[PDB]
Amino acid sequence: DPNANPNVDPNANPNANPNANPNANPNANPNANPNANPNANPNANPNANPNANPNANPNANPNANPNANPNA
Amino acid sequence: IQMTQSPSTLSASVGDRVTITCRASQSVSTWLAWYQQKPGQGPKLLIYEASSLESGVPSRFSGSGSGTEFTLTISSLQPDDFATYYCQQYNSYSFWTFGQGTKVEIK
Amino acid sequence: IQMTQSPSTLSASVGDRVTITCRASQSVSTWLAWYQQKPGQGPKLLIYEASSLESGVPSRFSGSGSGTEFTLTISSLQPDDFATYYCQQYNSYSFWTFGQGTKVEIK
Amino acid sequence: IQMTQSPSTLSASVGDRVTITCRASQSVSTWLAWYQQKPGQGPKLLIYEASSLESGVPSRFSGSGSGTEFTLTISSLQPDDFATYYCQQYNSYSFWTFGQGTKVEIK
Amino acid sequence: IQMTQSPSTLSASVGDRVTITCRASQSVSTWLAWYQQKPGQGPKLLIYEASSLESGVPSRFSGSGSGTEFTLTISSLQPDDFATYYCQQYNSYSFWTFGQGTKVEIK
Amino acid sequence: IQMTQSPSTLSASVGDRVTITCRASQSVSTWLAWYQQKPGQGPKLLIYEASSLESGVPSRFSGSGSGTEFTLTISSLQPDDFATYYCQQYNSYSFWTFGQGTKVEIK
Amino acid sequence: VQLVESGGGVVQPGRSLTLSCAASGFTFSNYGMHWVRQTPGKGLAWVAIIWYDGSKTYYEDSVKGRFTISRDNSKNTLYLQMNSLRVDDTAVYYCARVRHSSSRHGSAFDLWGQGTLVTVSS
Amino acid sequence: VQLVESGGGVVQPGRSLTLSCAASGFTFSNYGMHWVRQTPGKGLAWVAIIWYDGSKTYYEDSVKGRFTISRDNSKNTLYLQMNSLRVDDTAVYYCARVRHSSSRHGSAFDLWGQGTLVTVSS
Amino acid sequence: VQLVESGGGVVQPGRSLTLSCAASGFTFSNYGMHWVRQTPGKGLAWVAIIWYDGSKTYYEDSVKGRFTISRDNSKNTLYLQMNSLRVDDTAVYYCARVRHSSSRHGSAFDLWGQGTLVTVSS
Amino acid sequence: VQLVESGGGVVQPGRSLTLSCAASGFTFSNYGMHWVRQTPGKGLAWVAIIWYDGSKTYYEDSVKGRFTISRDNSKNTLYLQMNSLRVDDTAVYYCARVRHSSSRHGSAFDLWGQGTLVTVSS
Amino acid sequence: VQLVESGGGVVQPGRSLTLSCAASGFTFSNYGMHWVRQTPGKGLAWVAIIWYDGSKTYYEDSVKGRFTISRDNSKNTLYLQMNSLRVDDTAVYYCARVRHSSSRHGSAFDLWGQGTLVTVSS
Amino acid sequence: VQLVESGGGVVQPGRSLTLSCAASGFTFSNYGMHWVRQTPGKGLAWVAIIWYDGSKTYYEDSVKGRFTISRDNSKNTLYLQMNSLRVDDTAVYYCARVRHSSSRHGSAFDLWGQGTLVTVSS
Amino acid sequence: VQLVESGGGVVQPGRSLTLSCAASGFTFSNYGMHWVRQTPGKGLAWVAIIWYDGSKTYYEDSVKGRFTISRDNSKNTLYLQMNSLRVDDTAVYYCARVRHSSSRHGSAFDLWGQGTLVTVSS
Amino acid sequence: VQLVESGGGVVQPGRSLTLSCAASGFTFSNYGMHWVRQTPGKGLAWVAIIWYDGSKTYYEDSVKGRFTISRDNSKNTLYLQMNSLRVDDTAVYYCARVRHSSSRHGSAFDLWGQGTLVTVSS
């Protein structure tokens, strides 16, 4: 039937269509998403981070520390 | 995302009703914000996410819409509110772009 | 993010089965914790991440759920489990908020 | 989604018009890309989304089509444009597959 | 983080190519190190940050990986290199845990 | 931490504007310094902490930057400002290193 | 399962007015909705439809180019932004929810709102 | 409401030429389209029809197997690619839009483009 | 790969029971999963669905509002909180995984669990 | 391990009151801490946070600019200093220790003090 | 809570000019800030973004390789080092502060500076 | 911008080989990268993808469990650790950078390397 | 670069034994040290860390409150004092020197001692 | 404020040379000094640091064990005892004084000597 209304059938089902592919969509956008929240993340780990550099900090203030114990 | 606003110049009087239409060349979902830049100053945010009001904004301002058609409605125009209004979109994977700006002038 | 718990009052007897349900107005993923505040004391953590058990808490207590629906289940109510149980959420960019809490009474 | 290109090998002279047809086994909407691999080098993008040009590509290249029929047309073949062209599809729920590729030889 | 290695025992001869696989129960980014303990002695560092080589170690030893899959590849097994190799992780907020050790044996 | 300075030689005239760029192979936060060594003398500090000015230096010298990109800006070149400028970094756990040094000559 | 609208009032001809519709008690992001008038002295009349995503919209032949319909799935809202009103638009505007149907043809309007009166006069 | 064709020119017999057709001023994704040729000395002649999605196509018996019609709803364009052009295909190609009809039988062609001249000669 | 449930038992009518479903051997955060009942004397019956993210759920018409299906991608589990249990709900519950499909229409349930028995009686 | 508060009492509105929170039995200089209110007739409410060093600090939006939280790692002690106390601010204040988490996303409040009572009245 | 820039002036094409932006009244190290131009005869145009740490930077496609934005949380100061200036860049440059959002999708620019005028001419 | 691999050579069947891919001239931690074979006498074939974090990964159906791809954003490298090589795996392996797209459907591979020859034979 | 342990032997359960670790050939007071157990039949297991000054120490969960690690920068020695030993704690004890790292994330253990066997039995 | 060195000259490889550095005009006992080399054709290179009392020193990796830096606060004089010189070690040696800093992270080298020549050849 070449002659059949090729328009959209406006009276269609506009609902949610429960049978849609619920999988992961492996072809997506794997990039940086530049419009992402550029803020401080208040819920970050406020603890001590035990696995931190326990070394000597070779670049530290080698000066005289003028505010030191001036007593015996 | 090309963003355009109409009408470019909107004459209105004190106490009148004002509507400014912002159209996006692509679907920006609900990510859109409205600004206000009086001459010689820096723009001040009024509406974010196209519906919510920023803290300190008078209750007169309101906005609505989604997709590609957004409008900003001033229920009662005050002598304060005569300034240039800008429309911004920040979609998910799109960068921030601004509209040309409509200027509200005394009638 | 507003957290509400139902039922607010839950009568139960010794050896019964008790379920307390916490609902989040916005998706809080798996970030949720349950507390227990006997009157006159300070609340003690029972469940973190909505599933795990804090060290020292008896195996009776358990929790399940994700998204916006959560539930704390007690497999066997004991004489010292009659206290107010609270709900907390600590999402990515949301601050810590507590529910109003449900009180368990003897039947 | 199996993608085949025809003709496998075509000879064209300098300044001639060249058309390469890529046919998809199933509809791939408009997600499709055309490549170019000179011998011993790495393939370079020419056309993405089946119509748009990658930045830096001369306006000589052109591509059109949708559904299961795609073509790449070189308006005026140049001495530099003699290489093998590959057809790639990346549908929404399908993986990336490449056509066999056609070799453009000097007449 | 529970750290596991594979294979538990590996037979190889002089001049062969040996790969030892270390797999993490949780993501450890690129923080990982490979040791070598000859019987009766103390383990010696070979690879730190899972890719770089400790000073003085022969260029035979190499490693790669990130996340939860790590490998240690020896391009030419010498009579020196018959010893047990351990996998350590030191994540950001995690403590130090070691693998069970794979022993390279003469064939 | 490899430090590189560009451009190596910068011809300029009296009263011009000279900008020297210092780039760090890794992030050195705001710990950086700029020196000036006239031929046959010992270098003297100009800028420390990448922004502040040493006592007694003319107000012409200025610098800015943080992370990996640092620049030194001379508002008005003077006839005693034709000398070699060096870039130094002293990060937290990194040692002191110097750049190759650019020579500002008379145009 | 409650549907309430807002944004009514009386405006002079030629002005722009925006209506709204609040959805609660059901998953609003799963249903395509409608806007329906009820002019006294006449029956109901369809006005606009939104296709569950904002992808497709359709209008009555007499409001094309003046009435725009859009929805915010995050706030569970509908908007019928009306431009260049006439006296013929004096009516009560309802929201309608299209019932779930196991076909490709849609269903009738199952849940109706209460309605906001919009009057255009000089 | 604007519909513009492009891509015309002069080619040798046996070559391949593709055409383009851009739609503006109306939603292009909601209309099926036709391509109609105009040979000087003859009347209008139908060529191909696209079913609003590319899902169904039909061709004239004279160009079956050599003509491909496809549409890109994301850019509001039509594509009629001609393969193995002959001298008899020398005509002006028009885009036609099927008007909305409240039935299942379709309707006439509402909007026509200005057309582009495609000639084949030696 | 494997898919094992737990949390079954016998509870009185009206009580609340929580089921679990641990998935191993594959990337669990990639698949939308289902819960399926098996009442003896009747064929299998569908119960709920989780949309690979927890964003979308759809329930059987007889368990809407009494069953809550939710998933945790971090610990590779499923949960089906069952409230207001009745004597009818005595059935074996299965987990199901939706097969990868190269379309927009989903696929069948390939990986099924061993099932847990839930009994409601007085 | 023991955590007890102190410094509460009764003050007039508009005055300033300071609370202290002595931690004992554990390494205090390793934990980020909080302050939590419990108003009778309401649930627990979060007040402030201190980031294990004094480096970062966040407050509830109703106490910004009136409450100052600071810690003294050498004495194992917290301090929340109240300025311009109002009638609203009458509640019981608890210190909360953030649980150790093997990730970057913090954890729940495990060790809670016995709390102190702050009363603001005229 | 104020945000003021400096460093503007008149420079010849090809010369490098550096801008600064001092933030006061709020914790500056918690916010990712933007630089925005306002060319007379045009609307606002985005320039660069700094990601609260200096870890990530994105630029407008017309300034890549000539503009370097870097921040200093220790002194509460932004920098936009502009290299190889051209006559196009004559515009007023604004600082912008990104609003806190309870999500991962960002938010609008609430705090804007007063603008520093940059003129590039011979 | 530049993208150069390494680690090629000749190994016997059953042995393991690890390839590397160093990225220079662009920000590597923002792009999801691919690996593509090219067997002589056959066209290109996709192998694996890495999701810009290492969080998600996908492989060709014939290399699942034998090829493991992982990236090190701190040093701008890729690693396709190949285990249990076969005579089939004789090919040239390329790296690919996924072009930025202002959508959620990804884009094509815009930056390709020069490839390393991997030969498996005895 | 030498690192020698000492203090090993045989003790009855519940008794206290103290180890030492004499460093030689390098600046002992510049490095943070670890103690690592090796129980035959298992891999290495961590015990304690000392933070280059005695300021911070962290222990394994199974030895907290019974093992007290301390260092003496003046004589270049470590000390792991054990109290209330059990039959579990029989192993070989190694010292470990944390490698210098140009960052804040620590590094691996480069220099290991030869170890002294500690036997707990009756 | 002056810094003058001496003790340079020309010696054959394998010998030992001792440099000095006399400070005047300021309290030399308050300052941790550095030694810095300048080899023509190359930029400055750091050599050694002395920590204001002799507690800590750090050397460049290429001069460890051959250069011994020391100071004498009673004579305001540095000492760099050089042993086993090589043809590499010819350059100009500068003293550097570390600028006073109001923090713990050090500062730049503010006062520099006039440099001395150390030449090594056969």
Numbering used by the authors:
A (entry chain I): 2 to 73
B (entry chain L), C (entry chain P), D (entry chain N), E (entry chain R), F (entry chain T): 2 to 95, 95A, 96 to 107
G (entry chain C), H (entry chain A), I (entry chain E), J (entry chain O), K (entry chain H), L (entry chain M), ...: 2 to 52, 52A, 53 to 82, 82A, 82B, 82C, 83 to 100, 100A, ...
Text of the article:
Many malaria vaccine candidates, like RTS,S, are based on P. falciparum circumsporozoite protein (PfCSP), which is the primary surface antigen of P. falciparum sporozoites, the stage of malaria parasites infectious to humans. The structure of PfCSP comprises three domains: (1) a flexible N-terminus, which contains a heparin sulfate binding site for hepatocyte attachment; (2) a central repeat region composed of 25 to 40 major (NANP) repeats, which are interspersed by a few, N-terminal minor repeats (NVDP, NPDP); and (3) a small, structured C-terminal domain. Cryo-electron microscopy (cryo-EM) reveals a remarkable spectrum of helical antibody-PfCSP structures stabilized by homotypic interactions between tightly packed fragments antigen binding (Fabs), many of which correlate with somatic hypermutation.
The extended helical structures of CSP in the 337, 334, and 239 complexes are each unique, i.e., non-superimposable. As previously shown for 311, the tight helical packing in the complexes of mAbs 334, 337, and 356 creates a secondary homotypic interface between Fabs separated by about one helical turn (3 or 4 NPNA2 epitopes). Homotypic interactions consist mostly of polar contacts within apposing heavy and light chain framework regions (FRs). In general, the secondary homotypic interface contributes about half of the total BSA relative to the primary interface. Strikingly, however, the reverse is true with 334, where the total BSA of the secondary interface is roughly twice that of the primary, suggesting a critical role for framework region residues in the stability and/or formation of this complex. In HFR1E of 334, a mutated residue T19 appears critical for the interface and mediates a key hydrogen bond with S65 of LFR3B. While there is a range in the level of inhibition, many antibodies are highly potent and have statistically indistinguishable protection relative to mAb 317, namely mAbs 356, 311, 334, and 364.
